[PDB]
Amino acid sequence: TTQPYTWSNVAIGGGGFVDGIVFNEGAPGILYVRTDIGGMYRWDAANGRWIPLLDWVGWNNWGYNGVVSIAADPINTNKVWAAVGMYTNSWDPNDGAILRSSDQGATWQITPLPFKLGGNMPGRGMGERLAVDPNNDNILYFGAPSGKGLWRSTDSGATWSQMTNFPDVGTYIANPTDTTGYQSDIQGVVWVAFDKSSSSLGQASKTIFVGVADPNNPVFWSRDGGATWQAVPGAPTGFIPHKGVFDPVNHVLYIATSNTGGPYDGSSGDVWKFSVTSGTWTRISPVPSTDTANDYFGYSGLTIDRQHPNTIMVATQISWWPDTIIFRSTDGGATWTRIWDWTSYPNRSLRYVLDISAEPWLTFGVQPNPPVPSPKLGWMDEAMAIDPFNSDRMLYGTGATLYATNDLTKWDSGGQIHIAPMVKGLEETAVNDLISPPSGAPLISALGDLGGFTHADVTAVPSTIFTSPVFTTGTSVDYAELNPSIIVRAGSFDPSSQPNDRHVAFSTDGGKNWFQGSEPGGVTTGGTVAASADGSRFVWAPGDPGQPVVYAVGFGNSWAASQGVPANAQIRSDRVNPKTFYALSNGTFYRSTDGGVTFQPVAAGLPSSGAVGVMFHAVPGKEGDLWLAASSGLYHSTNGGSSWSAITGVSSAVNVGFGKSAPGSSYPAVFVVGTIGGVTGAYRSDDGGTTWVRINDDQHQYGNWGQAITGDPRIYGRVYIGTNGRGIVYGDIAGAPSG
């Protein structure tokens, strides 16, 4: 049974790291971006929006939203490829793949690779790893991580094998002692740049450069179309090349280097040019690494203006304070100017005007504090690209958004360029928790990096992230079910930089304004929080490992330890009885009936394994009525957790929530991301779990989604589902069910 639905994103706009930008060099108006956890997009200029291309990716192949590299075919501009896969350690159970499309990513074919890829690993801002030969589109190269070396396809990306003659698989490892495998992987072969001049169309390009993450040997080349390879003689040492771009008009290679792989660091590095004709390397760094006093950054975001290839740009990788710097040269690197300069301290002259009218929350809840701007130009600007058909258009990514200008050449004439977010249709947040209260705002969200929002209108970008306090990352939100103006949120931030602020905070006006009391010592992460049905008391399991579960009678006025419940348990409140709280920890279920003061175990040997951890939740209006989502099934208790029953027909559930009952039912509608009849997706039941209807489809899957889910108690059929890198999606009924 299926039901047609309409799916949309809650309006936020960007919110994550956009770590590559690829224009097609073959025809105008063809532009793609990649993200680390949130797929890739194509720019739709007619409608002024980004179109997501990988939302067909689901739970079975969820790593494919980790986009390692994009190549765009300049001979047949309908063609585009992507390298995909998210981690190279145990955290992604699947190998990566090369995806190919002949309709600009509307549809794709998949070739899995025999090894994992690192879309969300260290070094992900380096690239592009994947490249198409601009003289023969049958031929592609891919620089692989993990010591897999350099790969090639000679059938336009359908099949791949290793170039076993390539002499250096990479040596650089960010932290070889990391036993999780996250920092300890070889970063590998990091970009391929063709010399289009080195052949005529219809014949493979003979001269190929390859960037390698090996500070002693950062660049290799071939002159015979890959039959033989050598280190480019005289290549500079000591740094990893984030970027390599060839200019076949003047016959030079440009590289931008840093002492780390990025994307969060980089404290020294250089920009160099290599002349094919003379063999001469020329250092062209705006601030050279040999100027140890002043060079506090490496370099990345390397781009050439293809209409005027003496024009090149680069960005600091990385300058945290006072802001990033973006540099421009209109003479091949001989001289540079910058996007801002010191005048006399803390004053600066700016070559730009930054307008965040469409994305006002980008101040991150903080006023400008000279010399520090708010909003900032950016940070983690590994990606930057001038449009190869329009010198005035340039984009650059940051850790939180994508910025663009359409008047770039005003820079050269002594004016200010105009920069603004370019994120319509691009939603890249990672969602930890969601509530839809029965009065006030429709939706309050707990998000990675932004903290979260009170969303007055899910179609309108909010004005501000949560403030007083600002959270770096929101982990949990709740409301008092019978006093729904009372809201509680918990979250994560470094205490040393916010000592007046707390990791748990409150509102009595439905999330419009917040306030805070106290907290236990040593809290840095949010964990889970639960509000009593009357809003008079709260039970909180702070996030740091081993923090005792605590309760407050009041708004965090003061906290005392809850007896009988393990640190870091998942805490929920009953939606009816203001003195009843529940917890789940390592297969044991606990209940308190004295408002969180004491808990006792009431069931055990329960599910502890789930795709987003085991989730459970209490039902509005039904005392003691609990639903629990786990890898082995969806389970239901009607006696406060003392006993549980499998819901027949659901083989697995990621998460469960509730919304407004159907006409003629007095039970809330139940929504799950789960598996029914061998099909994983979103489902709603209007009769208390007896029957289920599928409410999404195979084009609307969103990968590892379901960390958060809630229905809307004011809108029958409406569901809000958190994703991990595609923001908050929501669904409405758009038709009658099939049966």
Single out the residue of 634, 649, 491, 617 nearest to residue 556, CA to CA.
Answer: 491
Q: Please give the Cα distance from 299 to 126 (Å, whole number).
A: 11
Residue ranges in 3-62 that form contacts with K ion under rule CB under 5 A = 9, 11
CB of 699 to Na ion, least distance (A): 25
User: What radius of gyration, in Å, describes the C-alpha atoms of the chain?
Assistant: 27
Q: Which stretch binds K ion (CB under 5 A): 137-145, 202-210, 371-379, 706-714?
A: 706-714
| Token duo for residue 669 | 């509608």
| 279 CB-contact burial (10 Å; exposed 0-12 / middle 13-18 / buried 19+) | exposed
Question: Would you give the DSSP letter of residue 82?
Answer: E
Residue ranges in 312-351 that form contacts with K ion under rule CB under 5 A = 332
> x/- site string to Na ion, residues 129 to 168, per CB under 5 A?
-----------------x----------------------
Single out the residue of 80, 92, 140, 136 nearest to residue 118, CA to CA.
Answer: 92
Whichever of 311 and 525 has its CB closer to Na ion, that residue is 525
Report the partner that residue 586 touches, choosing among Na ion, K ion, none (CB closer than 5 to 8 A by kind).
Answer: Na ion
Q: Which strand (E) or helix (H) includes residue 709?
A: strand 709-712
Residue 309 within binding range of K ion, rule CB under 5 A:
yes
Q: Which stretch binds K ion (CB under 5 A): 22-30, 304-312, 510-518, 670-678?
A: 304-312
Q: Which stretch binds Na ion (CB under 5 A): 187-195, 280-288, 498-506, 578-586?
A: 578-586
**Residues 253, 244: contact at Cβ < 8 Å?**
yes
Question: Would you give the DSSP letter of residue 496?
Answer: G
3-state secondary structure at position 150 = strand
Question: Would you give the DSSP letter of residue 547?
Answer: P
Binds Na ion (CB under 5 A): choice among 238, 346, 587, 677:
587
Q: What is the dihedral of CA 663, 668, 671, 674, to 10 degrees?
A: -120
* Number of chain positions touching Na ion (CB under 5 A): 13
CB of 404 to K ion, least distance (A): 17
Q: Please give the Cα distance from 739 to 736 (Å, whole number).
A: 8
CA distances from 575 to 315, 479, 739 (A): 52, 9, 33
3-state secondary structure at position 495 = helix
Binds Na ion (CB under 5 A): choice among 8, 228, 459, 586:
586
CB of 302 to Na ion, least distance (A): 17
CB of 661 to K ion, least distance (A): 12
Residue ranges in 421-460 that form contacts with K ion under rule CB under 5 A = 436
Non-local (6+) Cβ contacts of 293 within 8 A are: none
CB of 277 to K ion, least distance (A): 13
CB of 593 to Na ion, least distance (A): 20
CB of 506 to Na ion, least distance (A): 29
| Token duo for residue 368 | 């400008």
Residue ranges in 239-258 that form contacts with K ion under rule CB under 5 A = 247, 250
Bridge partners (DSSP) listed for residue 541? 528
The amino acid occupying position 711 is G
**Residues 383, 18: contact at Cβ < 8 Å?**
yes
CB of 707 to Na ion, least distance (A): 15
Residue ranges in 214-273 that form contacts with Na ion under rule CB under 5 A = 267
Residue 17 within binding range of Na ion, rule CB under 5 A:
yes
**Residues 579, 598: contact at Cβ < 8 Å?**
no
Cβ of 621: how many Cβ atoms within 10 Å?
Answer: 16
Half-sphere exposure of 255 (CA within 13 A, CB side): 32
Q: Which stretch binds Na ion (CB under 5 A): 14-22, 90-98, 126-134, 205-213?
A: 14-22
Report the b/e string of 163-186 with b at 16+ CB within 10 A: beebebbbbbbbeeeeeeebbbbb
Report the partner that residue 368 touches, choosing among Na ion, K ion, none (CB closer than 5 to 8 A by kind).
Answer: none
CB of 181 to Na ion, least distance (A): 7
Whichever of 35 and 568 has its CB closer to K ion, that residue is 35
> x/- site string to Na ion, residues 34 to 73, per CB under 5 A?
--x-------------------------------------
* Number of chain positions touching K ion (CB under 5 A): 8
- Which residue out of 19, 36, 295, 381 is catalytically annotated? 36
Known catalytic membership, residue 501? no
CB of 567 to Na ion, least distance (A): 12
- Which residue out of 137, 449, 625, 686 is catalytically annotated? 449
Whichever of 61 and 724 has its CB closer to K ion, that residue is 724
Whichever of 18 and 117 has its CB closer to K ion, that residue is 18
> x/- site string to Na ion, residues 606 to 645, per CB under 5 A?
----------------------------------------
Known catalytic membership, residue 73? no
Q: Which stretch binds Na ion (CB under 5 A): 502-510, 567-575, 660-668, 676-684?
A: 660-668
In whole angstroms, what separates CA 233 from the centre of its chain?
39
Whichever of 498 and 665 has its CB closer to Na ion, that residue is 665
Q: Please give the Cα distance from 323 to 315 (Å, whole number).
A: 11
CA-based max dimension of the chain: 82
Question: Per-residue DSSP letters for 617-683?
Answer: EEPTT-TT-EEEEETTEEEEESSTTSS-EEPTTEEEEEEEEEEPPPTT--SPEEEEEEEETTEEEEE
Whichever of 14 and 469 has its CB closer to K ion, that residue is 14
Report the partner that residue 185 touches, choosing among Na ion, K ion, none (CB closer than 5 to 8 A by kind).
Answer: Na ion
Q: Which stretch binds K ion (CB under 5 A): 123-131, 399-407, 630-638, 707-715?
A: 707-715
| Token duo for residue 528 | 């889970």
Angle, alpha carbons 88-92-93 (nearest 5°): 110
Residue 172 within binding range of Na ion, rule CB under 5 A:
no
Residue 723 within binding range of Na ion, rule CB under 5 A:
no
Q: Which stretch binds K ion (CB under 5 A): 1-9, 44-52, 70-78, 572-580?
A: 1-9
Question: Would you give the DSSP letter of residue 34?
Answer: E
The residues annotated with a catalytic role in the active site are 36, 449
Interaction site with Na ion (CB under 5 A): 17, 36, 146, 185, 267, 296-297, 318, 586-588, 661, 665
Interaction site with K ion (CB under 5 A): 9, 11, 247, 250, 309, 332, 436, 713
